[PDB]
């Protein structure tokens, strides 16, 4: 099944934040309405916050997360959770090798803001 794709409320501000846990340099791309809106990269085995940004979901609300390491796409896992029917997390993990810890780049999207 498709992973790392989330339908947000239209025209809504959301945070996106990426963490790295790998010897391989991570590249995180964030797409809104199928257009790249943010790119993060870094290299850490200690959960460095390699990027964080506020984006707007635009008229379609479609947000996609993609992860690659030195050109090769990572396998992704994802889900969305809603607390008290108001607070949203879109969660992404990724695997760039063979140990299957799926923490190599971790991405959290949260909304609403403000």
């Amino acid at each position: 099944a498709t992973q790392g794709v989330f339908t947000l409320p239209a025209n809504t501000r959301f945070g996106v934040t990426a963490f790295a846990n790998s010897s391989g340099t991570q590249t995180v791309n964030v797409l809104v309405n199928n257009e790249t809106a943010a790119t993060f990269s870094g290299q850490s085995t200690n959960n460095a916050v390699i990027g964080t940004q506020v984006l707007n979901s635009g008229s379609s609300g479609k947000v996609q997360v993609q992860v690659s390491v030195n050109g090769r796409p990572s396998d992704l896992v994802s889900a969305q959770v809603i607390l008290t029917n108001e607070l949203n997390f879109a969660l992404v993990g990724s695997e760039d090798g063979t140990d299957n810890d799926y923490n190599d780049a971790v991405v959290v999207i949260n909304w609403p803001l403000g």
Partner: peptide
């Protein structure tokens, strides 16, 4: 890389 040292 003949020496197994292609490193990340």
């Amino acid at each position: 890389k003949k020496c197994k040292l292609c490193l990340k």
